Write an enzyme that holds these catalytic residues in place. Structure first.
Site, PDB file in Angstrom:
ATOM      1  N   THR A 155     -13.371   5.966   6.092  1.00 39.68           N
ATOM      2  CA  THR A 155     -13.905   6.307   4.631  1.00 39.68           C
ATOM      3  C   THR A 155     -13.034   6.081   3.291  1.00 39.68           C
ATOM      4  O   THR A 155     -12.727   5.269   2.680  1.00 39.68           O
ATOM      5  CB  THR A 155     -14.997   7.255   4.430  1.00 39.68           C
ATOM      6  OG1 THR A 155     -15.825   6.802   5.644  1.00 39.68           O
ATOM      7  CG2 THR A 155     -15.874   7.246   3.182  1.00 39.68           C
ATOM      8  N   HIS A 261     -23.706   7.338  12.774  1.00 40.54           N
ATOM      9  CA  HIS A 261     -22.825   7.906  13.395  1.00 40.54           C
ATOM     10  C   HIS A 261     -23.839   8.839  14.487  1.00 40.54           C
ATOM     11  O   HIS A 261     -23.227   8.927  15.627  1.00 40.54           O
ATOM     12  CB  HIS A 261     -22.112   9.263  12.712  1.00 40.54           C
ATOM     13  CG  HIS A 261     -20.706   8.501  11.905  1.00 40.54           C
ATOM     14  ND1 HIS A 261     -19.722   8.641  12.886  1.00 40.54           N
ATOM     15  CD2 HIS A 261     -20.314   8.560  10.880  1.00 40.54           C
ATOM     16  CE1 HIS A 261     -18.444   7.999  12.078  1.00 40.54           C
ATOM     17  NE2 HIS A 261     -19.010   8.166  11.014  1.00 40.54           N
ATOM     18  N   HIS A 305     -16.937  -0.025   5.111  1.00 41.71           N
ATOM     19  CA  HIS A 305     -16.560  -0.460   6.288  1.00 41.71           C
ATOM     20  C   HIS A 305     -17.837  -0.432   7.189  1.00 41.71           C
ATOM     21  O   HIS A 305     -19.070  -0.011   6.750  1.00 41.71           O
ATOM     22  CB  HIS A 305     -15.835   0.731   7.044  1.00 41.71           C
ATOM     23  CG  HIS A 305     -16.176   1.973   6.960  1.00 41.71           C
ATOM     24  ND1 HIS A 305     -17.422   2.435   7.803  1.00 41.71           N
ATOM     25  CD2 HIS A 305     -15.841   3.027   6.431  1.00 41.71           C
ATOM     26  CE1 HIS A 305     -17.581   3.706   7.380  1.00 41.71           C
ATOM     27  NE2 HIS A 305     -16.805   4.018   6.525  1.00 41.71           N
ATOM     28  N   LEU A 684       7.966  -6.893   3.245  1.00 39.70           N
ATOM     29  CA  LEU A 684       8.593  -8.062   2.207  1.00 39.70           C
ATOM     30  C   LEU A 684      10.012  -8.333   2.767  1.00 39.70           C
ATOM     31  O   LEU A 684      10.627  -7.694   3.629  1.00 39.70           O
ATOM     32  CB  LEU A 684       9.126  -6.810   1.007  1.00 39.70           C
ATOM     33  CG  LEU A 684       7.781  -6.210   0.324  1.00 39.70           C
ATOM     34  CD1 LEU A 684       8.460  -5.243  -0.824  1.00 39.70           C
ATOM     35  CD2 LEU A 684       7.155  -7.249  -0.449  1.00 39.70           C
TER      36      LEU A 684
HETATM   37  C1  LIG Z   1       1.558  -3.966  -2.123  1.00 38.34           C
HETATM   38  O1  LIG Z   1       1.640  -3.770  -3.622  1.00 38.34           O
HETATM   39  C2  LIG Z   1       2.479  -2.597  -3.812  1.00 38.34           C
HETATM   40  C3  LIG Z   1       2.395  -2.558  -5.605  1.00 38.34           C
HETATM   41  O2  LIG Z   1       2.957  -3.428  -6.313  1.00 38.34           O
HETATM   42  C4  LIG Z   1       4.041  -2.663  -3.528  1.00 38.34           C
HETATM   43  O3  LIG Z   1       4.825  -1.656  -3.740  1.00 38.34           O
HETATM   44  C5  LIG Z   1       5.768  -1.635  -4.712  1.00 38.34           C
HETATM   45  O4  LIG Z   1       6.961  -2.050  -4.003  1.00 38.34           O
HETATM   46  C6  LIG Z   1       8.146  -2.022  -4.620  1.00 38.34           C
HETATM   47  C7  LIG Z   1       9.287  -2.472  -4.113  1.00 38.34           C
HETATM   48  O5  LIG Z   1       9.657  -1.876  -3.007  1.00 38.34           O
HETATM   49  C8  LIG Z   1       8.356  -0.459  -5.459  1.00 38.34           C
HETATM   50  O6  LIG Z   1       9.474  -0.664  -6.297  1.00 38.34           O
HETATM   51  C9  LIG Z   1      10.140   0.631  -6.069  1.00 38.34           C
HETATM   52  O7  LIG Z   1       9.878   1.578  -7.046  1.00 38.34           O
HETATM   53  C10 LIG Z   1      10.676   2.751  -7.227  1.00 38.34           C
HETATM   54  C11 LIG Z   1      10.420   3.836  -7.905  1.00 38.34           C
HETATM   55  O8  LIG Z   1       9.019   4.161  -7.326  1.00 38.34           O
HETATM   56  C12 LIG Z   1       8.317   5.192  -8.146  1.00 38.34           C
HETATM   57  O9  LIG Z   1       7.356   4.763  -9.136  1.00 38.34           O
HETATM   58  C13 LIG Z   1       6.432   3.822  -8.819  1.00 38.34           C
HETATM   59  C14 LIG Z   1       6.169   3.038 -10.156  1.00 38.34           C
HETATM   60  O10 LIG Z   1       5.528   3.873 -11.190  1.00 38.34           O
HETATM   61  C15 LIG Z   1       5.367   4.439  -7.962  1.00 38.34           C
HETATM   62  O11 LIG Z   1       4.273   3.520  -7.874  1.00 38.34           O
HETATM   63  C16 LIG Z   1       5.907   4.661  -6.652  1.00 38.34           C
HETATM   64  O12 LIG Z   1       4.881   5.300  -5.692  1.00 38.34           O
HETATM   65  C17 LIG Z   1       5.271   5.425  -4.561  1.00 38.34           C
HETATM   66  O13 LIG Z   1       5.928   6.539  -3.848  1.00 38.34           O
HETATM   67  C18 LIG Z   1       4.939   7.635  -4.374  1.00 38.34           C
HETATM   68  C19 LIG Z   1       5.624   9.231  -4.396  1.00 38.34           C
HETATM   69  O14 LIG Z   1       6.911   9.141  -3.715  1.00 38.34           O
HETATM   70  C20 LIG Z   1       3.632   7.588  -3.555  1.00 38.34           C
HETATM   71  O15 LIG Z   1       2.340   8.749  -4.176  1.00 38.34           O
HETATM   72  C21 LIG Z   1       2.798   6.184  -3.687  1.00 38.34           C
HETATM   73  O16 LIG Z   1       1.945   6.435  -2.755  1.00 38.34           O
HETATM   74  C22 LIG Z   1       3.831   5.396  -3.552  1.00 38.34           C
HETATM   75  O17 LIG Z   1       4.462   5.228  -2.134  1.00 38.34           O
HETATM   76  C23 LIG Z   1       4.756   3.870  -1.783  1.00 38.34           C
HETATM   77  O18 LIG Z   1       5.587   3.290  -2.056  1.00 38.34           O
HETATM   78  C24 LIG Z   1       7.093   3.862  -1.763  1.00 38.34           C
HETATM   79  C25 LIG Z   1       8.250   3.042  -2.442  1.00 38.34           C
HETATM   80  O19 LIG Z   1       8.093   2.891  -3.985  1.00 38.34           O
HETATM   81  C26 LIG Z   1       7.284   4.093  -0.427  1.00 38.34           C
HETATM   82  O20 LIG Z   1       8.413   4.796  -0.130  1.00 38.34           O
HETATM   83  C27 LIG Z   1       5.995   4.835   0.186  1.00 38.34           C
HETATM   84  O21 LIG Z   1       6.187   5.314   1.720  1.00 38.34           O
HETATM   85  C28 LIG Z   1       4.600   4.145   0.054  1.00 38.34           C
HETATM   86  O22 LIG Z   1       4.714   2.889   0.689  1.00 38.34           O
HETATM   87  C29 LIG Z   1       7.380   5.698  -6.937  1.00 38.34           C
HETATM   88  O23 LIG Z   1       6.848   7.086  -7.260  1.00 38.34           O
HETATM   89  C30 LIG Z   1      12.122   2.409  -7.441  1.00 38.34           C
HETATM   90  O24 LIG Z   1      13.001   3.570  -7.612  1.00 38.34           O
HETATM   91  C31 LIG Z   1      12.601   1.316  -6.325  1.00 38.34           C
HETATM   92  O25 LIG Z   1      14.031   0.920  -6.920  1.00 38.34           O
HETATM   93  C32 LIG Z   1      11.816   0.035  -6.540  1.00 38.34           C
HETATM   94  O26 LIG Z   1      11.507  -0.757  -7.668  1.00 38.34           O
HETATM   95  C33 LIG Z   1       7.146   0.202  -6.000  1.00 38.34           C
HETATM   96  O27 LIG Z   1       7.267   1.472  -6.172  1.00 38.34           O
HETATM   97  C34 LIG Z   1       5.814  -0.177  -5.047  1.00 38.34           C
HETATM   98  N1  LIG Z   1       4.673   0.532  -5.566  1.00 38.34           N
HETATM   99  C35 LIG Z   1       3.826   0.931  -4.981  1.00 38.34           C
HETATM  100  C36 LIG Z   1       2.420   1.785  -5.700  1.00 38.34           C
HETATM  101  O28 LIG Z   1       3.854   1.273  -3.643  1.00 38.34           O
HETATM  102  C37 LIG Z   1       3.922  -3.456  -1.965  1.00 38.34           C
HETATM  103  O29 LIG Z   1       5.217  -3.682  -1.977  1.00 38.34           O
HETATM  104  C38 LIG Z   1       3.184  -4.553  -1.889  1.00 38.34           C
HETATM  105  N2  LIG Z   1       3.108  -4.835  -0.229  1.00 38.34           N
HETATM  106  C39 LIG Z   1       3.202  -6.001  -0.057  1.00 38.34           C
HETATM  107  C40 LIG Z   1       3.068  -6.339   1.586  1.00 38.34           C
HETATM  108  O30 LIG Z   1       3.455  -7.100  -0.759  1.00 38.34           O
HETATM  109 CA   LIG Z   2     -17.401   5.389   5.098  1.00 40.31          CA
HETATM  110 CA   LIG Z   3      11.686  -5.639   4.260  1.00 43.80          CA
HETATM  111 ZN   LIG Z   4     -18.109   7.275   8.828  1.00 39.56          ZN
END
Ligand SMILES: *[C@@H]1O[C@H](CO)[C@@H](O[C@@H]2O[C@H](CO)[C@@H](O[C@@H]3O[C@H](CO[C@H]4O[C@H](CO)[C@@H](O)[C@H](O[C@H]5O[C@H](CO)[C@@H](O)[C@H](O)[C@@H]5O[C@H]5O[C@H](CO)[C@@H](O)[C@H](O)[C@@H]5O)[C@@H]4O)[C@@H](O)[C@H](O)[C@@H]3O)[C@H](O)[C@H]2NC(C)=O)[C@H](O)[C@H]1NC(C)=O
Ligand SMILES: [Ca+2]
Ligand SMILES: [Ca+2]
Ligand SMILES: [Zn+2]
Ligand SMILES: CNC(=O)C[C@@H](NC(=O)Cn1cnc2ccc(N3CCN(C(C)=O)CC3)cc2c1=O)c1ccc([N+](=O)[O-])cc1
Ligand SMILES: [Cl-]
Ligand SMILES: [K+]
Ligand code: NA
Length: 800
Positions: A155, A261, A305, A684
């Site tokens: 969910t 469920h 779902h 990526l």
């Molecule tokens: C699906 O779409 C998303 C959104 O476009 C893509 O995700 C983006 O990937 C790029 C490149 O890797 C990242 O850029 C980096 O950003 C950092 C700074 O990051 C901070 O600020 C951003 C922007 O405001 C924010 O969204 C980020 O948020 C992440 O971390 C948070 C807390 O730590 C968390 O609450 C949130 O869920 C998110 O976590 C996820 O992403 C991070 C990597 O950023 C990862 O470690 C974690 O496990 C999660 O997967 C963050 O605070 C710069 O310093 C770097 O140099 C670089 O530019 C974007 O951050 C990222 N955005 C998001 C929302 O994930 C995916 O690549 C795309 N997937 C595919 C397969 O295409």
């Molecule tokens: Ca559900």
């Molecule tokens: Ca990669």
């Molecule tokens: Zn359920």
């Protein structure tokens, strides 16, 4: 201890410790003392009866049938029907909504998201006789036969995906339950830990809307606000003055999931919950019509779902596999996530746990994976809250740690399984001025809706995992015009520049065994005379900075990377009539230098000889060469790639057997094949300084995966190379692994397990694009919106 009089369901949350009256105050235990009294009235139920018509207003009633109720905006939804001779919305013929038909002061058509829980796709046909309101929205508006959820098909991951356009690995809500090892904390569907913003990433639709000046409250709701009061609250908010009234609304139902469920997806007990949901949709629709908004509002009817038959007796226990089961923690059920019970343990061995769970029982109802080996289509790895060990559980089964976890039977339904599973599929219907009239659209993924909802609201979407433009066909009018990304690197077209004696690759070939009608024909081929035949959709664009060469040949064209020492892509076409040959014995180990490409940008045979783990295969297969002379082109060092012997078993069956069968079944196929490097499992393309493995003592980098994209005509009466209409595609991303442990039957003949492995690793063209930095289908006769839909297509391999 203030009061909620006049403040009931206020949109803005008030500052502490001053008491709250918004739709979330109950969750925080922070409502004013009179919240129940003033804001949760139930007296006299939710329907007008004749005896109430034109009553004297009684402010204690749940809703009103007095003459003043329209002005006040607080009539029971059936007021005009019971007291004014009006008809229920469901009883009206449907009429096309060509333009938004909104009262004065409405700046845009409102969006209302109507979200149902565990609403399996097949309910739309199977429950049709008991859901007349939903059946009307479905047939009158725009609908898909089903919508694909994200994995896991739980969910919370899905509702937040709906709101963000992001995969759970990116938005952070990776399960109904999870443990963050940095927070040292657990998130649970129930409880207050989930209220902490630290779990929730991305930018949900209500924030996108607010940042851009479109009013929208949070979509969350206190659990103890019942569904009839939720509808009345949305209908009330819709009567606010222009400067205060939101443009986006979300309603969520607990049904049919709650009952499914208990009873299974098709339990006899399931008919009533479907009736009740339909009745609720009826209430909203009658209410909209009362407010003259039924031809103004865009309504999305969407599930999170589906629901599958699952019972206690279909549980696999890890205690039957592991001797040391107390050293692990399991997230159990329709998926498995395993981590150490204690962090202070260097005597915890993931490889040994995985090995003890692999192919141990003949009918074993789950398969273990390191998370980076999971099918890439699931996009389920790049988050620290996703345990390294994952169990993909068979449909209809559960996994549990020990038998006492299950007997300390409750249920007959569950969900959570792999998102390709038919029973996990859910629903989408769009109805309103911006959606199309009586239109069926192909199945699509819920990650694409955030963009559409932004288009519906004039918003610029935050960066997300949808492909904007891929769902333009749902819309009567779109604000979004997609365009192809620009090519960053232009290719080089090298000529013949090197003599054989300049190479010292340690490679050998039996090829000296040596006419001007034929020799002019061979140089025409090396210059792209057959290129129209083998590159049917133009060459892929490279979307990053790099150095690469286009290489032409009689049978195949390639984009050869001087940085990665191998092709980024290899393109070729195999017609229905094409024939398979063998590799002549005298060319078994033939590798030939490519006189167009320098020794310094070439691979070498010596590295492979020295690397006792790594062998090599070829991207264009020798087996499919058009002639004994062309076959030589297939053995160029520039067509070679590193391959584990275990993986060569997979690849060789694909190239020698499956490619030809697809060409016979699909009336020719165009194939584009290539390596993928994703060592940090983020979905990526890796840059070169992220590569963790090279062929021993060389700079030849080792792929984590190999892809192929397989395209033909949707009308299969036309051959792949002469198609003048829409295209058909299936793709895969195969893990490049040194064993076949994933396939339990791999000791047997390839015809018993390879195709099964490839189907598991089916992929969208768009997944391969992210993974390679390439953009495909650049030159076709098809519109760009259609191509974008093609690129998001997944071939599921499920029955009808
Ligand atoms: C699906 O779409 C998303 C959104 O476009 C893509 O995700 C983006 O990937 C790029 C490149 O890797 C990242 O850029 C980096 O950003 C950092 C700074 O990051 C901070 O600020 C951003 C922007 O405001 C924010 O969204 C980020 O948020 C992440 O971390 C948070 C807390 O730590 C968390 O609450 C949130 O869920 C998110 O976590 C996820 O992403 C991070 C990597 O950023 C990862 O470690 C974690 O496990 C999660 O997967 C963050 O605070 C710069 O310093 C770097 O140099 C670089 O530019 C974007 O951050 C990222 N955005 C998001 C929302 O994930 C995916 O690549 C795309 N997937 C595919 C397969 O295409
Ligand atoms: Ca559900
Ligand atoms: Ca990669
Ligand atoms: Zn359920
Ligand atoms: C019948 N089914 C439903 O009603 C589904 C509904 N469930 C709830 O709202 C249950 N609940 C109840 N009280 C809460 C109070 C506070 C919060 N925090 C979360 C983080 N914050 C953020 C990020 O702003 C601040 C608020 C969450 C809740 C909460 O989840 C739901 C709607 C949308 C989404 N969704 O994911 O979009 C998920 C869940
Ligand atoms: Cl979970
Ligand atoms: K070797
Ligand atoms: Na095996």
């Amino acid at each position: 201890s203030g009061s909620c009089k006049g403040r009931c369901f206020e949109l803005q949350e008030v500052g502490p410790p001053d008491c709250r009256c918004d739709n979330l105050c109950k969750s925080y235990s922070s409502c004013c003392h009179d919240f129940d009294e003033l804001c949760l009235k139930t007296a006299r139920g939710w329907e007008c009866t004749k005896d109430r018509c034109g009553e004297v207003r009684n402010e204690e009633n749940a809703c009103h049938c007095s003459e003043d109720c329209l002005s006040r905006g607080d009539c029971c939804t059936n007021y005009q029907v019971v007291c004014k001779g009006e008809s229920h919305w469901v009883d009206d013929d449907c009429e096309e909504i060509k333009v938004p038909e909104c009262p004065a002061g409405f700046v845009r058509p409102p969006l209302i998201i109507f979200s149902v829980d565990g609403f399996r796709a097949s309910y739309m046909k199977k429950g049709s006789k008991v859901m007349p309101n939903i059946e009307k929205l479905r047939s009158c508006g725009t609908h898909a036969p089903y919508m694909r959820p994200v994995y896991p098909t739980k969910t919370f991951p899905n509702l937040y995906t709906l709101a963000t356009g992001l995969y759970p690995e990116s938005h952070g809500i990776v399960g109904n339950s999870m443990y963050d090892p940095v927070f040292d904390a657990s998130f649970h569907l129930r409880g207050r830990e989930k209220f902490n913003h630290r779990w929730w990433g991305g930018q949900p639709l209500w924030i996108t809307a607010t940042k851009q000046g479109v009013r929208a409250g949070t979509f969350f709701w206190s659990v103890s606000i019942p569904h009839e009061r939720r509808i009345l609250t949305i209908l009330q908010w819709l009567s606010l003055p222009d400067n205060e009234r939101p443009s986006v609304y979300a309603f969520y139902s607990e049904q049919p999931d709650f009952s499914g469920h208990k009873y299974g997806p098709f339990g006899p007990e399931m008919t009533n919950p479907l009736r009740e949901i339909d009745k609720t949709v009826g209430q909203l629709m009658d209410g909209l019509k009362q407010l003259r908004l039924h031809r103004c509002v865009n309504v999305i009817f969407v599930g999170d779902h589906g629901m599958e038959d699952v019972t206690c007796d279909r549980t696999e226990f890890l205690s039957n596999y592991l001797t040391n089961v107390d050293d692990i923690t399991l997230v159990p059920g329709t998926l498995g996530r395993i981590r150490a019970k204690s962090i202070n343990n260097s005597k915890y061995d993931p490889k040994t746990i995985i090995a003890a769970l692999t192919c141990k029982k003949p009918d074993q109802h789950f398969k273990p994976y390191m998370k980076q080996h999971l099918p890439k289509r699931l996009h389920y790895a790049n988050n620290r809250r996703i345990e390294d060990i994952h169990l993909l559980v068979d449909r209809r089964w559960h996994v549990a740690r020990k038998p006492l976890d299950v007997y300390k039977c409750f249920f007959q339904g569950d969900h959570g399984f792999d998102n390709k599973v038919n029973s996990m599929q859910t629903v989408f219907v769009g109805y309103g001025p911006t959606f199309k009239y009586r239109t069926k659209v192909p199945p699509f993924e819920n990650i694409e809706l955030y963009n559409v909802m932004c288009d519906l609201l004039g918003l610029k979407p935050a960066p997300n995992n949808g492909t904007h433009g891929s769902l333009n066909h749902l819309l009567r009018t779109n604000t979004f015009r997609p365009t192809m990304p620009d090519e960053v690197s232009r290719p080089n077209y090298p000529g013949i520049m090197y003599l054989q004696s300049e190479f010292d690759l340690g490679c050998t070939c039996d090829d000296k065994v040596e006419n001007k009608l034929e020799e002019l024909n061979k140089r025409l081929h090396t210059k792209g005379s057959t290129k129209e035949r083998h590159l049917l959709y133009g060459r892929p664009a490279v979307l990053y900075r790099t150095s690469y060469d286009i290489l032409y040949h009689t049978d195949f064209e390639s984009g050869y990377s001087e940085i990665f020492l191998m092709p980024l892509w290899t393109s070729y076409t195999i017609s229905k009539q094409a024939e398979v040959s063998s590799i002549p014995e005298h060319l078994t180990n033939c590798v030939r230098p490519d006189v167009r490409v320098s020794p310094g940008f070439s691979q070498n045979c010596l590295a492979y000889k020295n690397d006792k783990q790594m062998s090599y295969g070829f991207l264009f297969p020798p087996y499919l060469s058009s002639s004994p002379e062309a076959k030589y082109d297939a053995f160029l060092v520039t067509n070679m790639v590193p391959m584990y012997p275990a993986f060569k078993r997979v690849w060789a069956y694909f190239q020698r057997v499956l490619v030809k069968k697809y060409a016979s079944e699909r009336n020719g196929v165009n194939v584009i094949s290539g390596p993928i490097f994703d060592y940090n499992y983020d979905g990526l393309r890796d840059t070169e300084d992220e590569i963790k493995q090279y062929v021993e003592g060389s700079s030849i980098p080792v792929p984590t995966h190999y892809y192929s994209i397989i395209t033909s005509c949707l009308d299969f009466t036309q051959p792949a190379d002469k198609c003048d209409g829409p295209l058909s595609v299936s793709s895969f991303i195969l893990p490049h692994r040194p064993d076949n442990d994933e396939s339990c039957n791999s000791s047997e003949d390839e015809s018993k397990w390879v195709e099964e492995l490839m189907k598991m690793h089916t992929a969208r063209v768009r997944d391969i694009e992210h993974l390679t930095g390439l953009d495909f289908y650049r030159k076709t006769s098809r519109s760009y919106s259609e191509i974008l839909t093609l690129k998001t297509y997944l071939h599921t391999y499920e029955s009808e």
